[PDB]
Amino acid sequence: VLSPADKTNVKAAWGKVGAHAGEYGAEALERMFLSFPTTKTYFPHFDLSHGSAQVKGHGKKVADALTNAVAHVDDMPNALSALSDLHAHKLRVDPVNFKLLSHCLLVTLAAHLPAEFTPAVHASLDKFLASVSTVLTSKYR
Amino acid sequence: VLSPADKTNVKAAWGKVGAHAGEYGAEALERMFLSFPTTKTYFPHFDLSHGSAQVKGHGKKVADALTNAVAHVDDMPNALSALSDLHAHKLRVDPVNFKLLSHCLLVTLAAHLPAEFTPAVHASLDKFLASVSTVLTSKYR
Amino acid sequence: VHLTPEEKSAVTALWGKVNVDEVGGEALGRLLVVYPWTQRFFESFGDLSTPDAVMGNPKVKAHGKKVLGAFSDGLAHLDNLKGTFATLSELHCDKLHVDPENFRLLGNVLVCVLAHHFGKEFTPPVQAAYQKVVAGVANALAHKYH
Amino acid sequence: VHLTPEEKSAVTALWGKVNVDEVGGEALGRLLVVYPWTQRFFESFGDLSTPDAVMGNPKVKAHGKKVLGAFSDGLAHLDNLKGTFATLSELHCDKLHVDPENFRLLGNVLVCVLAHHFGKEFTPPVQAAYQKVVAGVANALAHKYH
Ligand code: HEM
Ligand code: HEM
Structure with missing residues (x-):
């Protein structure tokens, strides 16, 4: 479960990502x-x-x-509702595939955020991502 | 997500294991x-x-x-809270191991309950074992 | 794959008693039933909404056997799963775009079906061997993905 | 190990730039911070209670170096990893009882540490090769478990 420190770690990291987010997502x-x-x-x-x-x-x-x-860190399951149907019902994407994308978001973020990608934030970002992947995979059957 | 029909199958299946549950957990x-x-x-x-x-x-x-x-299927997370604290905080078993235990359980059940092990039953038990697994792997971090 | 001769042996003996038509349909059918997303790739097969439809769909039962036939071929080239499944891999990857994670599932439903068939005759030791084959196969159908 | 020479070349050229002292520490470090169930294996290491206790823990920093040494020594033998790591797999299995699944975490954590140090120079293709390397090291370290 994401914690307060987590929550905060993630807001500060994604905040720096700022405008370059689309870029980081394609990378x-x-x-x-x-x-x-x-x-x-x-x-x-x-x-x-x-x-x-x-x-x-x-x-x-x-x-x-x-x-x-x-x-919407505090209500992620309902914020991502739409995307969870897509991924788990129209698309049906095996959950390992999410671990994989997750891993590449981190590497990607790590390569662009030296000062920011500290051990504690790395741990927070991984939790967040596991969290999102868990929502996006929740309705698989 | 345990559907009433799953539940119904899980009840119906296990109750046949009955006094063999112990012998089967071992196998x-x-x-x-x-x-x-x-x-x-x-x-x-x-x-x-x-x-x-x-x-x-x-x-x-x-x-x-x-x-x-x-x-206690209708309320598994509260019913296992203990077990769950044991397999995650102190023992800490990699989720992946649960998939293997669950698979072997089905082989066992499959092997001893020939008439009961239908495609739908098969199916439901898989969502059931998966649900137990998730409950047991929830409080790691 | 590295399979003890006692294992190479445990496997074959049992295989020889396998009813290809019956087990091919149940595997393929339980896959679709138990892991519903798989249906996407077979939707040109017809009605596959409910278990009974899946387990009684002659296009399923038939493909089922085709699948087991290819399995049968790998049990004879155990020391060379790659060369045998090379074309089947390309196909599954270039034509059908099946995510190889689905191979494990089939492999495992397959073990589930055998256990269901042979009962006590499918001992823990026998199972370990098949677990190894079924994995070899999956890895083999995944080798030429690019 | 399916590592084109072109892949093989990138791997090496990057690794020459690596401060093995430091990288080993970071990697083992983040592993213990990010997947803290992996701390149970190292209780002889003293305080592990906060991110800083760890990253700065000298026993962590020393052991990290040992680890990376074993790693570099696999990059000098891409073509026989299973053998290079045969003694070390065995040990982790029989004496330390580590779930091989943790070798993959370390590997991915390694890769994130490379990405952190090198930057844009850690390109998708170099990462890609690096993923082949860590997976092989990992497979090779699980190979002797029984
Ligand atoms: C179906 C999922 C599982 C359930 C329901 C389950 C249940 C249990 C139970 C009831 C105990 C005894 C704890 C007590 O005193 O009440 C236990 C302990 C244990 N479990 Fe699990 N378990 C599961 C899966 C696993 C798996 C996948 C592993 C690792 C492969 C595992 C490893 C252990 C270990 C090492 C113990 C300690 C037993 C001892 O030291 O005597 N468990 N589990
Ligand atoms: C490792 C186990 C599997 C084996 C050995 C296998 C083998 C085959 C074989 C032999 C064919 C037919 C080639 C031909 O007709 O010339 C085939 C076709 C196909 N395979 Fe697999 N398969 C496996 C698992 C799966 C998985 C799990 C799926 C997807 C869930 C899948 C998707 C397909 C599809 C969609 C076709 C085309 C059928 C048609 O419409 O004609 N395969 N496969």
């Missing part, structure tokens, strides 16, 4: 597709070439969904 | 140690030879806890 997707191709199976339609605009844009929707969840 | 423990030897890392203080008093005895504790769960 995340790139790291994933490259480091774990199995994930590609869920995007047989995207153009996944380095620099793809289909990715950059999808990247942004993820970043935003994340900012939204940031903004 | 599952046996199958797990043998199929997935890395789960053994958690039982170094045990004798894990074919049919050993510890495995037998520990088999009854697992089975018995499951029975507690069926009977």
Whole structure:
């Protein structure tokens, strides 16, 4: 369960992410597709070439969904409702795939936030992400 | 998410295990140690030879806890709070090990309740074992 | 995969008593029933909403056996699962876009079905061997993903 | 280990820039902070109660170095990891009883520590190769469990 310190850690980290969030989300997707191709199976339609605009844009929707969840840290399950149906009902995305994307968000954030990516925040960001993935996977059957 | 039909199947299935629950928890423990030897890392203080008093005895504790769960399915998290504090704070078992124990349980049930082990029953027990697992893995961090 | 000769042996003996038509349908059918998302890839199969439909769908039962046939082929090339399943991998990845995590599930429902069939004859030791095969297979269908 | 020479080359070039002293400490450190159930294995290490107790714990810092040493020594033998780590897998299994699943956490935590130190230089393709390396180290460390 996210804690107060957690909550606070995450607001300060994502806050620095600020405007570059769409960028960070697409970088995340790139790291994933490259480091774990199995994930590609869920995007047989995207153009996944380095620099793809289909990715950059999808990247942004993820970043935003994340900012939204940031903004409703206390009611995440109901804020993300819509996305949990999508991922778990229309798409049906195995939950391991979320661990993977999660991992790449962290690496991505770690590569862009030296001062910020401290052990305690790293621990907070991982909890948050597990939290989001848990919501987004909640209605699987 | 345990649906009333799941619940109904879990009740209906277990009650057939009945006085064999103990004998079956043991077999599952046996199958797990043998199929997935890395789960053994958690039982170094045990004798894990074919049919050993510890495995037998520990088999009854697992089975018995499951029975507690069926009977209290409608409210599992409160009913297990204890067990849950034991497998997460002090013992701390990697969630993944639960998937292996649950799978072996089904092999056991599947192997002893031939008529009861229907596709739907199969299904429900899987959501059931999964639910127990989640309850048991919730209070780590 | 590294399979003891006693294991290579435990496996075959049992396999030889396997009713291919019966077990192929139950595996494939329980997969769709127990892990519902899988249905997405088979939706050109027809009605698959309710258990009975899935377990009685002749397009399921038939594919079921095709699947077990390919399994049968891997039990004979255990020392070379990769070369056998190479085309099946490409297919599953390039055509059908199946996430390999679903292979484990099939592999495991498969173990569930055998245990259901053979009863006490499916001992813990026998199970460990099949657990190893079923994993080898999955890894093998996942090798040519890119 | 499916590591194209191009992949193999990036790995090495990056690793030459690595301050193994420091990286080992950080990695083992974050592992104990981020997945604090992994602290049970090291109770001889003194205070682990706060992020700083850990990151600064000398026994942590020393052991981290040992760990990275074993790591570098695998990068000098990508082609026989199972052998390189055979004594060490065994030990972690038989004497320490560590769930091999923790080797993957360490690995991913390693990768985040590389990303933290190197920056944009830790590109998706270099990460990608690094993921192949940590997975192999991990598989190789679980290989002798029985
Ligand atoms: C189906 C999920 C599980 C349930 C319901 C369950 C239940 C239990 C119970 C009832 C106990 C005895 C605690 C007491 O005194 O009341 C126990 C202990 C224990 N469990 Fe589990 N368990 C489960 C899964 C696991 C798994 C997956 C592992 C690791 C592979 C595990 C490892 C242990 C260990 C090492 C103990 C200590 C036993 C001893 O030291 O004597 N358990 N569990
Ligand atoms: C490792 C176990 C599996 C094996 C050995 C296997 C093997 C096969 C085989 C032999 C074919 C037919 C190739 C042909 O007809 O020429 C096939 C087709 C197919 N496979 Fe798998 N499969 C496995 C698991 C799965 C999984 C779990 C799914 C998805 C849940 C899946 C999805 C499909 C689909 C959608 C087809 C095409 C069927 C059609 O509409 O004609 N496979 N597979």
